[PDB]
Amino acid sequence: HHHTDPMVSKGEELFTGVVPILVELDGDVNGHKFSVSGEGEGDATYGKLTLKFICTTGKLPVPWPTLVTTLVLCFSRYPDHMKQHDFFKSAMPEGYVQERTIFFKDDGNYKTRAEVKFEGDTLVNRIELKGIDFKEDGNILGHKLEYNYNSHNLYIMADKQKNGIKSNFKIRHNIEDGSVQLADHYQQNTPIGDGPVLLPDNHYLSTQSKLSKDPNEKRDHMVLLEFVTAAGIT
């Protein structure tokens, strides 16, 4: 890589080539406790993520699709003309906090707090998830969501008061009867270090994701192939 901006050069260099990824989540939804471990790699040059998650406590008590957004936007591909707006890489290696509240329409909500940072050469996403007010018979605790995923656009805005960013966006999960379960996402990110970060102009991330299964895997699990591209600045 080569950019006239040495702050951009610093973040891009950490994400040159393929980077290993570790994901660790501890969850509690309506008192159903569970843990998830994920591994894979990210190639930010192509906005490309490949990850396999395993529920390490047994059966996952919520549908795998509902955890996709919770389970590393530093791997988004930012076009060269937009690399000055890449908050996620500029906070590295010290990292950033990512917090969300996810309102499932006519059901409960997830509250998530995660730290995303480097441990050596590995990009680590360590998460705590708290879910409350779900219907034990609803689409989530009742496992009524199809095992697939749509493409979305997340609008990113600066949160200058907090030296970070915020976004709110809608995820739609297909219900097995042909309907949709809306998951309204509210998100904020703040750096972990004291160093300077890139505060972006308004733009968006364009996502696409494919969920699959490992045919030789007997544990409850999800294979994810995901692409994320920044856009919206001409």
Side-chain angles (χ1 to χ4, degrees), residues 49-93:
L49 283 182
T50 53
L51 291 168
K52 174 183 175 189
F53 306 98
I54 291 160
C55 173
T56 58
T57 48
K59 171 165 186 63
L60 194 70
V62 298
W64 280 109
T66 69
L67 301 184
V68 165
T69 52
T70 294
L71 295 164
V72 285
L73 295 170
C74 48
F75 286 106
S76 308
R77 174 175 78 84
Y78 272 72
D80 178 274
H81 75 280
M82 295 183 61
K83 277 180 189 304
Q84 67 262 53
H85 304 286
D86 187 348
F87 165 87
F88 308 96
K89 299 188 184 54
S90 75
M92 297 296 162

Side-chain angles (χ1 to χ4, degrees), residues 161-227:
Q161 48 278 64
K162 295 250 72 199
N163 204 30
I165 60 179
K166 57 188 185 168
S167 170
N168 72 83
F169 56 96
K170 294 170 175 298
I171 301 290
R172 291 171 180 94
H173 300 294
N174 284 5
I175 306 173
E176 287 174 331
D177 61 6
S179 201
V180 302
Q181 170 66 64
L182 170 65
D184 279 317
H185 283 57
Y186 289 85
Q187 173 182 337
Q188 60 194 21
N189 297 60
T190 47
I192 290 179
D194 222 358
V197 299
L198 296 172
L199 299 184
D201 290 350
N202 297 348
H203 65 282
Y204 63 92
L205 301 177
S206 172
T207 64
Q208 74 199 280
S209 306
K210 301 202 171 182
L211 315 188
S212 60
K213 296 292 192 176
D214 178 351
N216 297 125
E217 179 58 73
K218 293 290 188 315
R219 297 167 292 182
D220 201 1
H221 70 286
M222 167 176 69
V223 179
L224 172 67
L225 172 72
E226 172 167 293
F227 296 91

